[PDB]
């Protein structure tokens, strides 16, 4: 009765060899739990990777429709539903995720209630319905008992640090996570291991440890086939080369862009950094979003205007942005641009202070180079990057 069961029953009467093929793909010892899954409603595999690996290799193009149907039909009190919630969150399938959260909050199993409550906190935080301070308050209010939700509560805040351009807390949060403590759920452990890897990759990218950054991103790319992890992995590798190597940076951004086909949210990340890359290297720029009101997007239009030596038009557009709320990292770039336009040392010092505040050891190079060009002590500038 669940779409995937119907699909597999249909394909099985046409082809008898599919039992053995699905058994090895699902990591099963023998074809028996497969028979059970197809016949007795309610049967769920011991490991959720069983259903994902069957869906991925047999119905590559119907994953979302099939998975959405599987998940909405699951008993919310079970390990399966708990894994489906992780699956949905990891892929950013928000319709699947919000409906599981709704029904997991209400039910009477303590573990599923906990998973519901923590993922809701993560969702409310990504959407700006709450801020870090309420998140932390809600996490403690929960008195979490599982190792997993303890770990996921640390990652939750790391994701917020990452999009608010506040990178200092993140290595500190990372160090509080130990994955071998998660015992029952093998799938959840795998998913987390991969989440951590891109997280780690970002941490190193901001610490300017560029070799380790690419190590962890590649580690993620090698072991996953979930679109979300591919996207951010390639995003990260490309940013790691933004200042060293134009071609390597372009190529990873294009690889990532191909993996993002038909998901406008993921595409936007690449368009933005391709915009920046081409502005920074002063190459022709097919990527600028000229009618976005987003601070990052207006910054790109200004940076382009600077390269076309239109310093007057650039200054007016930049004053318009002083009106707008920006995070510390965005102020970093803001003051860098003010400097290129105005040739004032002051603008560059501010830029360094903001990149220090947000602890972006990567971007700090830009205003530092500029200060060295205007006669500031080079030895001291070296000590600032230490």
């Amino acid at each position: 009765m669940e779409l995937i069961r119907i699909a597999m029953k249909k394909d099985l009467e046409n082809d008898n060899s599919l039992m053995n093929k699905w058994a090895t793909v699902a990591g099963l010892k023998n074809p028996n739990p497969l028979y059970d899954f197809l016949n007795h409603d309610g049967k769920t595999f011991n490991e959720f990777s069983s259903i994902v690996n069957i869906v991925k290799s047999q119905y590559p193009d119907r994953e979302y429709e099939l998975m959405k149907d599987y998940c909405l039909n699951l008993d919310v009190k079970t390990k399966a539903a708990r894994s489906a919630l992780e699956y949905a969150d990891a892929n950013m399938f928000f319709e699947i995720e919000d409906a599981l959260i709704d029904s997991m909050i209400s039910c009477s199993n303590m573990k599923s209630k906990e998973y519901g409550k923590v993922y809701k906190i993560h969702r409310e935080l990504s959407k700006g319905e709450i801020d870090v301070f309420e998140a932390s308050a809600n996490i403690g209010k929960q008195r979490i008992k599982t190792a997993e939700m303890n770990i996921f509560s640390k990652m939750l805040l790391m994701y917020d640090c990452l999009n608010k351009g506040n990178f200092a807390p993140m290595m500190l949060l990372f160090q509080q996570i130990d994955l071998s403590e998660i015992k029952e759920n093998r799938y959840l452990k795998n998913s987390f291991e991969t989440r951590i890897n891109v997280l780690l990759s970002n941490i190193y990218l901001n610490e300017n440890n560029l070799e380790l950054c690419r190590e962890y991103a590649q580690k993620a790319i090698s072991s996953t086939d979930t679109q979300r992890f591919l996207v951010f992995s390639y995003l990260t590798i490309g940013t790691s080369y933004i200042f060293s190597d134009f071609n390597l940076s372009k190529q990873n951004y294009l690889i990532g862009l191909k993996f993002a086909k038909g998901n406008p949210g993921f595409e936007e990340f690449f368009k933005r950094n391709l915009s920046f890359l081409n502005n920074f290297w002063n190459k022709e720029n097919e990527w600028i979003n000229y009618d976005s009101d987003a601070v990052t997007d207006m910054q790109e239009v200004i940076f382009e205007l600077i390269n076309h030596k239109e310093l007057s038009k650039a200054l007016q557009l930049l004053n318009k942005l002083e009106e707008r709320d920006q995070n510390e990292n965005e102020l970093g770039f803001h003051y860098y641009l003010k400097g290129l336009i105005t040739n004032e040392k002051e603008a560059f010092f501010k830029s360094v202070e903001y990149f220090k505040a947000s602890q972006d050891k990567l971007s700090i190079k830009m205003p530092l180079i500029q200060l060295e060009k205007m006669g500031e002590n080079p030895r001291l500038l070296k000590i600032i990057t230490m």
């Binding site: 940013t239 933005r272 920046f276 965005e330 770039f333 971007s363």
Partner: peptide, 6 residues
């Protein structure tokens, strides 16, 4: 700006 995501 540079954008990031994990």
């Amino acid at each position: 700006g540079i954008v990031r995501g994990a």
